[PDB]
Every structure is written in structure tokens, then in C-alpha cells.
Symmetry: C2
Subunit: 197 residues, 2 copies
Amino acid sequence: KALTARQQEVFDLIRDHISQTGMPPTRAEIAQRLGFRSPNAAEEHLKALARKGVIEIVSGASRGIRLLQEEEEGLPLVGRVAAGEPLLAQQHIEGHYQVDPSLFKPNADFLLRVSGMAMKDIGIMDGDLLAVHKTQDVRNGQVVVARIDDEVTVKRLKKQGNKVELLPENSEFKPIVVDLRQQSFTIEGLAVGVIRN
Amino acid sequence: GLPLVGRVAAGEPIEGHYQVDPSLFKPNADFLLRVSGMAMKDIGIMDGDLLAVHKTQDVRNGQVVVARIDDEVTVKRLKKQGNKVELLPENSEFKPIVVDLRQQSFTIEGLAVGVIRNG
């Protein structure tokens, strides 16, 4: 749009932080992670971002930052994911494609590149672009995008008490059993379609 | 966008327009065809999928093509040898189709360059 290289870094940090915690970072957190001389330096960049209209500064109150112009055209394509980083971290986005989100039901929020042949039998191949609807409200038998201790995977869900079995659709593969008592597990979304190009 | 200009047979005997960048495919897609049947299931082309097609006559052995044999459009893997055209499925339950160019009408409609599955 019109951001300098450094403003872009501050802006990316803000979005990543919101995507991972649900709230903006403080001026101190920004200064620390980006190696700025002080909180005053971070404030200046925030002022310029507010000026460019990408955020709104709610004076007073800690973490008083709001993102604007969220409504965007197309769909971002998520490539590889890194450990300790939200699925939709800016570093993971390899582009935005002009595809009607409403072609899918529920509507697609993002595209994710599939790795491996685990879901071959239902037509999802290595390298396919999976259309995903962001939600945690899912049910047994649905194909979901889940994260197991930082590893992301696409499998059919089968809840089993304190465990979760992630079923593949390929005879060469076996189920992945997740013990909720000792592993981090989160649902990133619901698969709603596929684009192979 | 891409027009859905019809159906294509894949082991089973304009109706729309979609807002999908034709440049997402290479070569570029010219139109979409609705797939019928599971003849190409082994390479991920399923019944009901929208097959993105690039209009061209220049295809080669091994490629997935859209062909018309006596006015019936099908999608299969091509294997040509002189006057012998073999249209192979990607499903071990299906039989390959052999076409003799001296006896039957045969035209390549296009090259498959992608798929869209939206349920």
C-alpha cells in the first residue's frame, strides 16, 4: 500500500501478535522484539501506521491498538508453518489469490498447501491447495486442519475421550493418536474444498 | 472468471460462471467442465469436481486430456501410437479405451490443467 520497510515490520508484528494471542502488543513488546532504542521509537512507527490508516490508536488504556481495513479480496495462501508461530503469520503467507470465497460452503477464509498423500482416497493430493473455513466448532467425521505440538496436519476427526484419533484416507497410513493430557492440540479449521493447479 | 460450459465423462454416462483467476493455472484455463464418474480417482479427479481446461490441440502421451469420441466428451490419460489411440483411466476397475483414427471421429478438446472441488 505505502509502508516503509520498517513500518511493515512493525505492522507484521502487530498482526502476528493478534493472530496468536487475540490482542495487540504493547509499545515495550514492539521495541524489545524489533530492537528499538525505546518505547518512544515504537510509538512513532505506530503513529505513522495510524496515519496510513492500517490501524486505529485508542489513546490511553494498554494495548490500545485496532486494525482497520480488514475486509480483503481473494484468499491468502498459507505455505509452510513454523513452530511457535500462528498459522496465519505473515511470514507463512505466500500470496493472495483471486478466488470467490463464497464458492465454498462454509466460506473459505484461507488456502493451505497440503503436504503428503495421507488423504489420497478422498481426492486430496500432495501439493493441493486446501480451502479452509476458520473455526473450532467441528464434529466427528469431518476433515479438519489440526495442530499437534506445532505440527499441522489434515485428517478426519475421531474424538476418543481424553484422546483424539486423526484418521487418514490412505491404506499405507495409520491413525495419529493424540493424548490431550500431554500434548498441545488445537483445531485450526474445517476443510471446505480443494484447488489443484 | 471461468465459464462452466458443460459436463465431461469420466466413467459415467453454459451452466455457470466462476470468479476464479484463470492465471492460477498453467497454461491458463479457458473453461471448466463438470466431471462425472470415478474413472480418474487415482490421481485425485473425483465425481462432481470442476475440471479446469486449456483449449489446445497440442498434447502428448501421459497428459490428462479432454477428448471427444463420436460426440461424447471424456477425460482420460492419452497414449497415442500412429493410428492407435489409447485412452487410459486412473482407476484399476476401468478398462482402457482404444480408438482407431481411420474408423472413428476423434478430436482433442483440451488439456486438463487443474481442479476445483467445492462440494
